[PDB]
Curated annotation (Swiss-Prot), chain B:
Belongs to the universal ribosomal protein uL4 family. This is Large ribosomal subunit protein uL4. One of its GO terms (molecular function) is rRNA binding. It comes from Mycolicibacterium smegmatis (strain ATCC 700084 / mc(2)155) (Mycobacterium smegmatis). The gene is rplD. Signal peptide: none annotated. Residues 1-46 are annotated as: Disordered.
UniProtKB/Swiss-Prot annotation, chain C:
It comes from the Bacteria. Keywords: Ribonucleoprotein, Ribosomal protein, RNA-binding, rRNA-binding. Coiled coil: none annotated. GO terms for cellular component: cytosolic large ribosomal subunit. This is Large ribosomal subunit protein uL22. One of its GO terms (biological process) is translation. The keyword Ribosomal protein applies. Belongs to the universal ribosomal protein uL22 family. One of its GO terms (molecular function) is rRNA binding. The chain holds residues 6 to 119 of 153 of the full protein. Part of the 50S ribosomal subunit. This protein binds specifically to 23S rRNA; its binding is stimulated by other ribosomal proteins, e.g. L4, L17, and L20. It is important during the early stages of 50S assembly. It makes multiple contacts with different domains of the 23S rRNA in the assembled 50S subunit and ribosome.
UniProtKB/Swiss-Prot annotation, chain D:
One of its GO terms (cellular component) is ribonucleoprotein complex. This protein binds to 23S rRNA in the presence of protein L20. The lineage of its organism: Bacteria, Bacillati, Actinomycetota, Actinomycetes, Mycobacteriales. NCBIfam families: L21 (TIGR00061). This is Large ribosomal subunit protein bL21. InterPro entries: bL21-like, bL21-like_sf, Ribosomal_bL21, Ribosomal_bL21_CS. It comes from Mycolicibacterium smegmatis (strain ATCC 700084 / mc(2)155). Belongs to the bacterial ribosomal protein bL21 family. GO terms for molecular function: rRNA binding; structural constituent of ribosome. Keywords: Ribonucleoprotein, Ribosomal protein, RNA-binding, rRNA-binding. Part of the 50S ribosomal subunit. Contacts protein L20.
Swiss-Prot record, chain F:
GO terms for molecular function: rRNA binding; structural constituent of ribosome. InterPro entries: Ribosomal_bL20 (IPR005813), RIBOSOMAL_L20_CS (IPR049946), Ribosomal_protein_bL20_C (IPR035566). CDD domains: Ribosomal_L20 (cd07026). This is Large ribosomal subunit protein bL20. Binds directly to 23S ribosomal RNA and is necessary for the in vitro assembly process of the 50S ribosomal subunit. It is not involved in the protein synthesizing functions of that subunit. Keywords: Ribonucleoprotein, Ribosomal protein, RNA-binding, rRNA-binding. Belongs to the bacterial ribosomal protein bL20 family. The keyword Magnesium does not apply. The lineage of its organism: Bacteria, Bacillati, Actinomycetota, Actinomycetes, Mycobacteriales. It comes from the Bacteria.
RNA sequence: GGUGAAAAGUACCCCGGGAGGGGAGUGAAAGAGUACCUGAAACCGUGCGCUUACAAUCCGUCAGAGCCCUCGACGUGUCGUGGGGUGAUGGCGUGCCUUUUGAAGAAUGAGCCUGCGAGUCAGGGACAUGUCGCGAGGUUAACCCGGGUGGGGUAGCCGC
RNA sequence: AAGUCCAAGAGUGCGGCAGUGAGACGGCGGGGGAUAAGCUCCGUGCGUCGAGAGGGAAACAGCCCAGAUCGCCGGCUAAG
RNA sequence: GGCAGCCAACGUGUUGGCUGGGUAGGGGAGCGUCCUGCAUCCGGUGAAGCCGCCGAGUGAUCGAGUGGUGGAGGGUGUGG
């Protein structure tokens, strides 16, 4: 029978990704992979064996084109005419982490497990984070050649 | 549904009640209603050709004859007084099988009465001989008069 | 296991759900505490339920020789009895059905160490 | 050490002493059967060339013949009146691996 | 307006569970030397003998 | 010969209701409702026995890919290289190696990479 | 419509205004108590095990963590050619019938269970096709005689 | 003239038993309509649906791929 | 690896080739129920019915396999 994780089997690790000068979409896809646990041979779709991901310098994220002014984050309050929009430029100035957060969350599965996976994402605007006690491993976004 | 008592009137109006439409309280779907395609008295007799009936009887009697199950006797009992005890003993000497067909002429009341009460014994006259009773019996016992009467009416 | 006595009141002219509403106040309590609660409960079905509990306590004393103080109401339930059918005439020839429900009430009391 | 054994169009990782259910083989219980290998792992070293794998065979003993789970099929399509009930139990052979 | 559908066993029970009695809080009173339990609301009446302690 | 139906009729009801144990509400309790669900249940089961083979292969492939990329090779080039080397291990067992014996899997990756063409993106 | 072989139909004691019940008796059995043979299902309770209050569920299916129970070998729990109960979580997934070009359909019918409810029967009827007897012939109708299902009956009929 | 030819389960004739005689969309050739309709009426050894599950097209009878005898925790591909 | 239909090849039933989506509808072969001719068997040392357990067959379904409840009939084979 195919290997299935048991109670004690999942081991977490802590990664830190520097978002400075990284393309938003590229950072988010990489982080979603780590949070989901796709890089582990023990991956199981009904189990969150993902790792913790810390994103630092989330205000230095790079976006190409005119998306800074023309890309709009939309929210609806549920009241008639309750549709509000912000550009990514405005959202980066007021809530720097929200830009990276939304990008990563939208690349996670939209189910109960996905919500549990989101717990393991921590994102910070500045160069620093409070999690030195967890000794995060610097993670660089590489591409395996073929 | 036509023979059941009552049921002549349409129970309620065709439309407006909100109930299924009904034509009679005795319709088949009703409890107490008429039966559909139920039994009716019928005659089951069949017009089997004469030659088939005769050949079947001959076949049955031949099967007994080949297995030596045909016996012949002058009388079941001696005298003019029925006695089941005598007949039972005598039949016991002839056959030990349970079912026995005894073929006796009409006149031999004392023989018929003497065997009548025995459990597996069936009594018949030779003019009434038939496949069912022969095949039901383990052994056929003929009065000599009855056997000759049967042979004569057929082989002549 | 504990020594126990049973009482039943059958064909009590009270709906089983209305009895249950009272019974839920006394399940698991000592017989003394149950009879106090039932004495002051405003519900009508309190009175039939009280009588069954007291009857079971009395059986435990007089038939089984248990002491009354140690008695607790271990198990109690009401089951539905036969329902009588009545008709209430309504407006414009409508005739509606009325159900006169009854219930059976079972109590088991245990002698437990205090 | 362990090997990956081919039998019945399927492959099973087995070591000495392993019990494996495989597709029916024609042998009595107590008979020994010899099976081809797709891979051998002897601790650190991996045998993978077809030439050396042809040299090696796994020996197993037939324990018993058995039946898999009863499968109940009830094909159906709505608004048609089409129903087709069918049952199935696959015949299996149980092997105990003896050596590699 | 009439119910559109029958109500599931679960939904019926969830609502029906809200129909329940609450036990009265009881206090002890000494009357005729014996200690009886009465609602605190009736404490004064019970000492005055205005409550029928059956 | 009037025949009462209960004896024959009840048999199929008991079968269906036994099969529908564990269902919720009317589907566990009423023969007609349980029968309806049984139609779906056995249709689903038949369909999922077929789909199960793809679903497991999907799992194995994902696990092989993670282990391959941890050894600096993509899945597609690993499969190509194993074919070129003539290694006939299927994906069920390749995934079991990736989990239970990373050393053996690493040795297979080396074999596959050696058998790959020098210029994978060259004609032929 | 059915207590039991027999009324032997529950003396007497206990709780209760009664009703009803608990002891004690009768009986082979009260898992037979005049609500009575057997006592299904819907429907309504109580107890125990697992589960469930961040979740969008045609209600199931295939994967499946954790817990509970049980059968083997070994030892203090742990593994197996196991078996049950429950099921976090993941994938897949548009009731049944009728009737329609096409219905998950916001078309029709069904609140639920149990019982009942629809190609049957008559006739030397008609056509075809199996099967059996007899065969250039086959067969009787009415009727007559047998306590029968058997024997007789040539008028007819159908082939030629 | 060959092919297929342990069969297309082919044609033709007779007989027993039918059902059907409301079709839909898509490709190609046309009428009616404004060279409108998810329109309407014909042709097409044209297709699919009807009576067809599976994969693709987000979902999506009629499009693309492919015709489900059952089992497998094997492998290779189609459209994509 | 199991089952089935058609056909072939031989044998005193096995091997092989091909085939096995399906509504209206045609054909074939069966399951379960009751009443009966005949033959057999079980039953107050507990029949039927009902509730379970553990199992069984390609399906309708089965259990002369077994617990519980129950109290008088029932099973099987071959025909009608
Ligand atoms: Mg009259
Ligand atoms: Mg009339
Ligand atoms: Mg009329
Ligand atoms: Mg009648
Ligand atoms: Mg005649
Ligand atoms: Mg009036
Ligand atoms: Mg249709
Ligand atoms: Mg596949
Ligand atoms: Mg009894
Ligand atoms: Mg009653
Ligand atoms: Mg009774
Ligand atoms: Mg929660
Ligand atoms: Mg959603
Ligand atoms: Mg979905
Ligand atoms: Mg229409
Ligand atoms: Mg149609
Ligand atoms: Mg509807
Ligand atoms: Mg609706
Ligand atoms: Mg209409
Ligand atoms: Mg309705
Ligand atoms: Mg017409
Ligand atoms: Mg027409
Ligand atoms: Mg047309
Ligand atoms: Mg049109
Ligand atoms: Mg088609
Ligand atoms: Mg399709
Ligand atoms: Mg491939
Ligand atoms: Mg392609
Ligand atoms: Mg064959
Ligand atoms: Mg078919
Ligand atoms: Mg096919
Ligand atoms: Mg049909
Ligand atoms: Mg039977
Ligand atoms: Mg007895
Ligand atoms: Mg009977
Ligand atoms: Mg028959």
């Amino acid at each position: 029978p195919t290997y299935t994780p048991k109670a004690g089997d999942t081991t977490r690790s802590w990664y830190v990704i520097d978002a400075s000068d990284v393309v938003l979409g590229r950072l988010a896809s990489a982080a979603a992979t780590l949070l989901r646990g796709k890089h582990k041979p023990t991956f199981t779709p009904n189990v969150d064996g993902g790792d913790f991901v810390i994103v630092i310098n989330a205000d230095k994220i790079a976006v190409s084109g005119d998306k800074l002014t023309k890309k709009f984050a939309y929210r609806h309050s549920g009241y008639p005419g309750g549709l509000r929009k912000r550009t990514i430029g405005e959202l980066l100035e007021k809530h720097p982490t929200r830009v990276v957060e939304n990008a990563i969350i939208g690349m996670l599965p939209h189910n109960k497990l996905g919500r549990q996976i989101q717990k393991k994402l921590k994102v910070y605007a500045g160069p620093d984070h409070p999690h030195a006690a967890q000794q995060p491993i610097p993670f660089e976004i590489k591409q395996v050649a073929q | 549904r036509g023979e059941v008592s009552g049921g002549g009137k349409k129970p309620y109006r065709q439309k407006g009640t909100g109930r299924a439409r009904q034509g009679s309280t005795r319709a088949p779907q009703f409890t107490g209603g008429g039966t559909v395609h139920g039994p009716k008295p019928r005659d089951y007799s069949q017009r089997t050709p004469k030659k088939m009936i005769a050949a079947a009887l001959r076949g049955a009697l031949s099967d007994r004859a080949r297995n030596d199950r045909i016996h012949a006797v002058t009388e079941l009992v001696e005298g003019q007084t029925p006695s089941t005890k005598s007949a039972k003993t005598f039949l016991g000497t002839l056959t030990e099988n349970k079912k026995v067909l005894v073929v006796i002429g009409r006149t031999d009341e004392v023989g018929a009465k003497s065997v009548r009460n025995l459990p597996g014994v069936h009594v018949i006259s030779p003019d009434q001989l038939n496949t069912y009773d022969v095949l039901n019996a383990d052994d056929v016992v003929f009065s000599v008069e009855a056997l000759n009467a049967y042979i004569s009416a057929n082989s002549k | 296991e504990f020594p126990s006595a049973t009482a039943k009141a059958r064909y009590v002219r009270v709906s089983a759900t209305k009895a249950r509403r009272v019974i839920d106040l006394v399940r698991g309590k000592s017989v003394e505490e149950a009879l106090d609660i039932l004495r002051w409960a405003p519900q009508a079905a309190s009175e039939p339920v009280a009588k069954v509990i007291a009857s079971a306590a009395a059986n435990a004393q007089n038939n089984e020789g248990l002491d009354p103080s140690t008695l607790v109401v271990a198990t109690v339930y009401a089951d539905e009895g036969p329902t009588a059918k009545r008709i209430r005439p309504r407006a414009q020839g409508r005739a509606f059905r009325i159900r006169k429900r009854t219930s059976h009430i079972t109590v088991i009391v245990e002698s437990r160490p205090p | 050490t362990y090997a990956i054994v081919k039998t019945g169009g399927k492959q099973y990782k087995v070591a000495a002493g392993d019990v494996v259910k495989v597709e029916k083989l024609d042998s009595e219980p107590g008979a020994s059967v010899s099976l081809p290998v797709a891979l051998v792992v002897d601790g650190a070293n991996v045998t993978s060339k077809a030439d050396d794998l042809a040299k090696v065979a796994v020996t197993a003993e037939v324990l018993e013949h058995t039946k898999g789970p009863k499968i109940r099929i009830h094909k159906f399509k709505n608004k048609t009146g089409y129903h087709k009930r069918q049952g199935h139990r696959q015949q299996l052979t149980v092997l105990k691996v003896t050596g590699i | 307006a009439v119910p559109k559908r029958r109500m599931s066993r679960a939904n019926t029970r969830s609502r029906r569970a809200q129909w329940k009695a609450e036990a009265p809080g009881l206090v002890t009173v000494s009357v005729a030397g014996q200690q009886r339990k009465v609602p605190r609301r009736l404490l004064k009446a019970a000492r005055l003998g205005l409550v029928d302690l059956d | 010969a009037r025949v009462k139906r209960a004896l024959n009729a009840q048999k199929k009801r008991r079968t269906v209701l036994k099969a529908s144990k564990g269902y919720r509400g009317q589907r566990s309790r009423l023969y007609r409702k349980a029968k309806e669900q049984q139609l779906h249940s056995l249709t689903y089961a038949y369909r999922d026995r077929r789909a199960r083979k793809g679903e497991f292969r999907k799992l194995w492939i994902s696990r092989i890919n993670a282990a391959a990329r941890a050894n600096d090779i993509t899945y597609n080039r690993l499969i190509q290289g194993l074919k070129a080397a003539g290694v006939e291990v299927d994906r069920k067992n390749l995934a079991e190696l990736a989990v239970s014996d990373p050393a053996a899997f690493t040795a297979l990756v080396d074999v596959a990479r050696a058998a790959l063409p020098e210029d994978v993106n060259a004609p032929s």
